[PDB]
Amino acid sequence: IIRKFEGQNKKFIIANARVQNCAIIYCNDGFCEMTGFSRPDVMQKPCTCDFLHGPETKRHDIAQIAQALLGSEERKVEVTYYHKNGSTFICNTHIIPVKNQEGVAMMFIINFEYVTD
Amino acid sequence: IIRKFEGQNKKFIIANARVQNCAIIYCNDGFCEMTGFSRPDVMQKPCTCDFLHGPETKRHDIAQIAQALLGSEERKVEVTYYHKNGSTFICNTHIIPVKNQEGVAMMFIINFEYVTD
Numbered sequence: 001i002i003r004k005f006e007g008q009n010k011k012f013i014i015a016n017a018r019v020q021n022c023a024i025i026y027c028n029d030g031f032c033e034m035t036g037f038s039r040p041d042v043m044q045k046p047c048t049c050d051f052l053h054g055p056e057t058k059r060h061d062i063a064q065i066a067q068a069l070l071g072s073e074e075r076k077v078e079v080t081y082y083h084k085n086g087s088t089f090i091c092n093t094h095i096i097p098v099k100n101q102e103g104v105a106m107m108f109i110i111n112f113e114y115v116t117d
Numbered sequence: 118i119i120r121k122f123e124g125q126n127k128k129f130i131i132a133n134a135r136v137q138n139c140a141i142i143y144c145n146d147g148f149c150e151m152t153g154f155s156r157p158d159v160m161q162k163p164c165t166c167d168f169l170h171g172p173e174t175k176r177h178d179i180a181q182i183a184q185a186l187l188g189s190e191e192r193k194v195e196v197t198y199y200h201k202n203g204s205t206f207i208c209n210t211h212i213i214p215v216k217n218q219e220g221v222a223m224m225f226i227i228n229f230e231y232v233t234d
Binding site for chain 1: 118119120123124125126131133142143145146213215216217218223224226
């Protein structure tokens, strides 16, 4: 799926699911271009991407994203996020756990799909 | 393929193909267990994994691995590597570039397959 995502100029990050802050260890050019955050501004931040949250970002939506991460579940959540420039965009945030054979999530791939209003 | 690899307890790393030293940004438990190198000893090292090289590691084999990385090519190379404890193992090193739509490698996934002698 990292090949699918990178190959189609998807907008995604990869995070380390083993460390307590779910540190982003990779973000692709498409995620920086869409959100207006520079790669040095995204790297090592929590995988929840709280730097995308603003006033109109709904608490219920933030909680469903955080819950999927905590439960190591695949989930798709529609949410309002904010470009660096303070403009709103609707996003479908697709959390994909990457699990060992024992079923333990080692990484998350999170894909961000822009949704026109 | 990161899902395939992690899900089957393959032994692999992911590297950032954008930075000059091809920095390892992820290594799985199976790669640490097989090679005897701790995760803190592998992280951020070059993706060539020179810490696996010893006397019986052939220069021609090291060069074919490095060439595939430099040319952003998928390649499989059989090579002699060294466990931390100084014992030899034969490895099939499988370099997989992860390219953007424009064809530019952004990451490498490198899988290490033990080969019995």
